[PDB]
Amino acid sequence: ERDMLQKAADETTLKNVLVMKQAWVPYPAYTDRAAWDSLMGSNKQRLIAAGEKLLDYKWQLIPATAYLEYERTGNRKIMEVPYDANRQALNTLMLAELAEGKGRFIDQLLNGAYMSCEMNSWVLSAHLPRQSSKRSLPDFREQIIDLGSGGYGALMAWVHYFFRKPFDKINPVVSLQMRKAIKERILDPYMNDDDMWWMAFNWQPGEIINNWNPWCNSNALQCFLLMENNKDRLAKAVYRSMKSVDKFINFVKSDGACEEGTSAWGHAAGKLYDYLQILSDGTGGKISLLNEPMIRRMGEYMSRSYVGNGWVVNFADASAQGGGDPLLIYRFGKAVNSNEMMHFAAYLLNGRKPYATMGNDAFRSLQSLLCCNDLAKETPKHDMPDVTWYPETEFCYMKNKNGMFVAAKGGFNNESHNHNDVGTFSLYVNTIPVILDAGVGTYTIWTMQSNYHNLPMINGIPQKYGQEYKATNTTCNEKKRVFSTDIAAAYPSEAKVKNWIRSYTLDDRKLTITDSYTLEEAVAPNQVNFMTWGNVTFPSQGKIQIEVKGQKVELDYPTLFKAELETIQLDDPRLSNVWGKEIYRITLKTNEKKETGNYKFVIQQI
Amino acid sequence: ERDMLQKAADETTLKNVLVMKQAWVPYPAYTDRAAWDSLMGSNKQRLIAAGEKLLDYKWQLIPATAYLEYERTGNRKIMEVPYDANRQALNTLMLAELAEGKGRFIDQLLNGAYMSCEMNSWVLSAHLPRQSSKRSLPDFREQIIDLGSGGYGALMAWVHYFFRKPFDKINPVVSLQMRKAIKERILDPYMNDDDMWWMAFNWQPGEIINNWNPWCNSNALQCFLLMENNKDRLAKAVYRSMKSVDKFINFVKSDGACEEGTSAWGHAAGKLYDYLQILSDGTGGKISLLNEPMIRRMGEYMSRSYVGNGWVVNFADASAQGGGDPLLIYRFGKAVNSNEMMHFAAYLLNGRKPYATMGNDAFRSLQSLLCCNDLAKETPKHDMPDVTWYPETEFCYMKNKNGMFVAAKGGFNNESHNHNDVGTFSLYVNTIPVILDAGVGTYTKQTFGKDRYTIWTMQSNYHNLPMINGIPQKYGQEYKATNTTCNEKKRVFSTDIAAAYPSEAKVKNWIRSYTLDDRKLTITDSYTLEEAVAPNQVNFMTWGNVTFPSQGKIQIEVKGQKVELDYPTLFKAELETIQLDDPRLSNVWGKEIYRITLKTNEKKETGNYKFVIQQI
Numbered sequence A: 001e002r003d004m005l006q007k008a009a010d011e012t013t014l015k016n017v018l019v020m021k022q023a024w025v026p027y028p029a030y031t032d033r034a035a036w037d038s039l040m041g042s043n044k045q046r047l048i049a050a051g052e053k054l055l056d057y058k059w060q061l062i063p064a065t066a067y068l069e070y071e072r073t074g075n076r077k078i079m080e081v082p083y084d085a086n087r088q089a090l091n092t093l094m095l096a097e098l099a100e101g102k103g104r105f106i107d108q109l110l111n112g113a114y115m116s117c118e119m120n121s122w123v124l125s126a127h128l129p130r131q132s133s134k135r136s137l138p139d140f141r142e143q144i145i146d147l148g149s150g151g152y153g154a155l156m157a158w159v160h161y162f163f164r165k166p167f168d169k170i171n172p173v174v175s176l177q178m179r180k181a182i183k184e185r186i187l188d189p190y191m192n193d194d195d196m197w198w199m200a201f202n203w204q205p206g207e208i209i210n211n212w213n214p215w216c217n218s219n220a221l222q223c224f225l226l227m228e229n230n231k232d233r234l235a236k237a238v239y240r241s242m243k244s245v246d247k248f249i250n251f252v253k254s255d256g257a258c259e260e261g262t263s264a265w266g267h268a269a270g271k272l273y274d275y276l277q278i279l280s281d282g283t284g285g286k287i288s289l290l291n292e293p294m295i296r297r298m299g300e301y302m303s304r305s306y307v308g309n310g311w312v313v314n315f316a317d318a319s320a321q322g323g324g325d326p327l328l329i330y331r332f333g334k335a336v337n338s339n340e341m342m343h344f345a346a347y348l349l350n351g352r353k354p355y356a357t358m359g360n361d362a363f364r365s366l367q368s369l370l371c372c373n374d375l376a377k378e379t380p381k382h383d384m385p386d387v388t389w390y391p392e393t394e395f396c397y398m399k400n401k402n403g404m405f406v407a408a409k410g411g412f413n414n415e416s417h418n419h420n421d422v423g424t425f426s427l428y429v430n431t432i433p434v435i436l437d438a439g440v441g442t443y444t445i446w447t448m449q450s451n452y453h454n455l456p457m458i459n460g461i462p463q464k465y466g467q468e469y470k471a472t473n474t475t476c477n478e479k480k481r482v483f484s485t486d487i488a489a490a491y492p493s494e495a496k497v498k499n500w501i502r503s504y505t506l507d508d509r510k511l512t513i514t515d516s517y518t519l520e521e522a523v524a525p526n527q528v529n530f531m532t533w534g535n536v537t538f539p540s541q542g543k544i545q546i547e548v549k550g551q552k553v554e555l556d557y558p559t560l561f562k563a564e565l566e567t568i569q570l571d572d573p574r575l576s577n578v579w580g581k582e583i584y585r586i587t588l589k590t591n592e593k594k595e596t597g598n599y600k601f602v603i604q605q606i
Numbered sequence B: 001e002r003d004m005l006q007k008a009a010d011e012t013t014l015k016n017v018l019v020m021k022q023a024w025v026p027y028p029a030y031t032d033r034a035a036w037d038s039l040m041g042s043n044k045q046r047l048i049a050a051g052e053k054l055l056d057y058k059w060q061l062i063p064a065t066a067y068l069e070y071e072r073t074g075n076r077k078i079m080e081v082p083y084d085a086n087r088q089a090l091n092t093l094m095l096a097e098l099a100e101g102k103g104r105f106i107d108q109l110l111n112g113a114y115m116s117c118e119m120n121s122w123v124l125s126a127h128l129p130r131q132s133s134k135r136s137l138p139d140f141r142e143q144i145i146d147l148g149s150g151g152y153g154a155l156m157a158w159v160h161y162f163f164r165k166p167f168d169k170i171n172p173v174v175s176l177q178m179r180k181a182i183k184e185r186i187l188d189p190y191m192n193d194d195d196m197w198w199m200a201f202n203w204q205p206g207e208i209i210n211n212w213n214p215w216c217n218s219n220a221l222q223c224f225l226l227m228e229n230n231k232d233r234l235a236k237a238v239y240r241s242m243k244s245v246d247k248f249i250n251f252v253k254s255d256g257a258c259e260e261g262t263s264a265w266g267h268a269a270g271k272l273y274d275y276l277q278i279l280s281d282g283t284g285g286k287i288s289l290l291n292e293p294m295i296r297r298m299g300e301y302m303s304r305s306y307v308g309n310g311w312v313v314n315f316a317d318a319s320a321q322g323g324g325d326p327l328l329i330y331r332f333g334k335a336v337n338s339n340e341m342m343h344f345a346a347y348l349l350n351g352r353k354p355y356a357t358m359g360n361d362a363f364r365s366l367q368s369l370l371c372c373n374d375l376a377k378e379t380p381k382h383d384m385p386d387v388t389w390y391p392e393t394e395f396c397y398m399k400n401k402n403g404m405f406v407a408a409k410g411g412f413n414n415e416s417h418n419h420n421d422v423g424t425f426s427l428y429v430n431t432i433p434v435i436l437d438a439g440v441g442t443y444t445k446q447t448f449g450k451d452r453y454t455i456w457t458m459q460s461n462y463h464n465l466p467m468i469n470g471i472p473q474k475y476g477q478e479y480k481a482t483n484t485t486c487n488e489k490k491r492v493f494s495t496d497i498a499a500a501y502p503s504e505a506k507v508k509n510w511i512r513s514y515t516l517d518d519r520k521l522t523i524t525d526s527y528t529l530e531e532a533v534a535p536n537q538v539n540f541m542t543w544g545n546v547t548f549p550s551q552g553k554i555q556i557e558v559k560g561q562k563v564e565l566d567y568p569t570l571f572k573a574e575l576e577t578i579q580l581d582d583p584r585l586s587n588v589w590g591k592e593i594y595r596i597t598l599k600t601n602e603k604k605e606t607g608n609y610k611f612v613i614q615q616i
Ligand SMILES: CC(=O)N[C@@H]1[C@@H](O[C@@H]2O[C@H](C(=O)O)[C@@H](O[C@@H]3O[C@H](CO)[C@@H](O)[C@H](O[C@@H]4O[C@H](C(=O)O)[C@@H](O)[C@H](O)[C@H]4O)[C@H]3NC(C)=O)[C@H](O)[C@H]2O)[C@H](O)[C@@H](CO)O[C@H]1O
Pocket: A124, A126, A127, A147, A148, A208, A210, A211, A212, A359, A360, A361
């Protein structure tokens, strides 16, 4: 219950600071060709070309059966593809006309806008079943908001804002309809409906609040800021958005890790940023959380979690490959004043020249034009501390100067997109995974089990799913580079374990993994596993060797263990696109069976 | 002011006799597969096939720019081509699904209906400028009705009627938006707006009432009969529709003749037929002008006017080639009980088996199913009296047993689609034009307003008529025939054409007369002038192979017909070639036609010309 926006002003003080008549708008007027020439630079001629390709684009109809198919077979893309292609084209066209100025894309901008008003809803088939009727087909009677409708409304607003005057010369009915559509599909349902789930009024513990919230709110706000000119009305809506987005802020951890991973980041924390950007712009700076310590942490997670060459720390159900919108990262950085975020984004360009964000998020596409000539001139470096320690989320990254990076976690077995992986670690060498976390396929799914994480099977028994299957006493020593936790309570009763302390210590030349255990009873041998890939050898007892994408390490293990290599064929292409054909589980097993014991494992380059 | 419908019933009568809950509908229940099979005959398999080809039809969106083009450049097709494709597809899919009844086309029918409700309007871009704002782009705030939307409406309503149960199983919001679309776009504008030009409330002398009136009213009425279940509202809507259509019935001439010719007939008299048929069906037989002799004449006009092998009488700005929807001509014929029209329809089939009417007009399409089996059994015959005389319109048709047909007219030079053509004639031999009426051209700017009569097709000079003292007819109401008679038994048309020429003509009397016997047409002129200024000149339009074997003889051989034209030897005969640049004319006539000019030195205040045409 931080309530940081509610604290930063109430409805009344808000009224005094709001900027009316769209004076907040940081882009030029449409008709100011010289000011658009400056901003655009090298973007101009490409955005044009991108418009030229859409001069004969046929705006795609979305038949009823496409929404019907959601109910029938669950197919989403039959509806989403023509929709999204239409959004993209409108956005592209918007960008092209702002580039060229010479009227040439107005006719198509007008068609797109006119078609969009003809549609019954802007809501996706998959999300329409939240309406009263619970149906997949749009009901003219009722509007709700989902991620799509919000983005659509926002782009229709910007196109209204920029193009009303040449639209009104041609025929003033087109802009009139646009204002009716935005009213009836955004502004009105957003004020009159309390119960939309993502608004998070009526939230009680357990229920989810996620990326929907800053995202939809960010778009709602743009609409209201662009389309609503009555001052009492505006203030009422902007405040309602702040009471909603405070509910997201009071649910995410202060340490500022996105616990779903770096793919979710651009639309979770990245949209919280966009909401706070838009709010600041639209109060001339005076309501801004952009200086808050927690927002900068939420931003820097994207840099921290990025190891290199596309390789990201991929806890829970996430991909080992990933990336980011450099142009967003840069803007997010600058705004919160992270030199690390700003240089990181330039590094992420990988020697490319940055061009304007295309896609369908008009805001981001517009904001991408502002940033361009700054980020083009910023210098590429990914420097960061040897340790990052998220104490609440319980994520720990540690590295050394010879290319070893270790991620470690505690947590609990009901994290977002949970994996049963309390205590697990991942080791990268010069960016390349060597002890890996499998990641996301397209708890009887193997990727989900502790069995296929870097963890023991205590008395032979894996981790159970659940809230109360958890780390105790997770600690990090930031100068020593020691992570430690007690994973015992992640295991069910039959594990019969008082303490099992897993610990990770990175020094400049090796990583030392220790387990240290007290059983209530020795029922069956412990088994310890490691995941890897490439060329795994066993050159002598107590020694595993791994050579992969040019890196070479040795894993020393206790000689009481017999190591085997299990091969895992990846049929699932969402795994085989990352790793390839196959990865291995190493299995360390034994006949020994003691009530109290420990193991020590050492990984180093050779 | 006949007011035939208002006389046949007032609102109070109409309510006692209206049929509610669509019990008037004459087609089987969509569910009654055996009844449809029997009705469908061998239509079933060909309709199912038409539907098969549309199972993946992508419904066309109509972009704003398509509507904007009517204002920018006057282009109609950019908008209408996709619209008509959408309708045809929907109408077809309706027929297919009725035929097959297994639910295979329901998804596409559902798509068509839903897509149509998302459209702002069903009005053609060319007609929208009649809306308040006066623009060609739809305005979500306002609906007017035109030929398109009325048509789109009736189709939607029939789709709703047949397919509601299957639609509701899938998702009941579609049929709901269907009921709302029809209501805002048809039922409410029709009820609430007095001032749509085609309704002709507020009609004043010298304003136009035309096919739009019976056409739109017939479609509005369908929507009301299918969609309005409140009897008080329905009766008020139907009575409104009767008041409106009376204005059309009042406007046309009782003698039956459609004076623009047969090319409007289908959607003029044809659509007045549909409207009475619908109204009859609507009132369980009780309100019906189908027994009215005037309606029967209007139907039979199409029969009498159709000479044969594509050729029709073409006074005024009309095409010498014409045709007919046999299935409609049959239904119209049976309902007014005109054997001539029924036999005619069969003749017009040209040996073809009659299959279901496709297109986009749901009413004709469905009605066609009912009439296919009978029309197939009908014997083809194009018989009719030797003489048909339309006395108000001043059209006279005369024919003999050896293959000659003469059309002649008196009239006035301000008829619909007027040609300066008082007194002219057209001669056909075995259905082939021999002395012709050139007909309709591609429109120019000159076509309308002054300069109309600088276009040759429009002048008496290029019709079958004299130039009195070297002067042709003038445009205008007052320039007209006097003493038009027709002796129906002697086959003699006669008329005084003097008053159709201006002052400069200096003409008291000119009697042009036509006599047909069993072999030859005798054209006679007999004139009295005020002052003989210039010599007279007499013209005849023709085509094919024209020769001049001797003085006072002309031979014409065309499409295997051959005649001789005997003319007073006082005249010097020349042949003017008329090359036809205009495709609209060359597609009927070929490369060229000819005007035979007959010039003289003679000059007198009174005199007398005889001409004779017969087969050789
Ligand atoms: C069916 C349902 O209601 N399920 C909810 C579930 O909702 C689903 O969540 C996803 C999410 O990310 O939260 C949504 O996935 C994203 O939807 C976006 C628009 O529909 C789409 O744009 C995202 O894809 C991205 O596109 C960007 C772009 O616009 O260009 C790219 O920059 C980006 O790289 C790309 O990833 C799409 N994300 C994907 C595919 O990863 C989904 O729409 C939504 O239905 C809720 O989140 C959960 C929470 O409890 O409840 C379920 O029941």
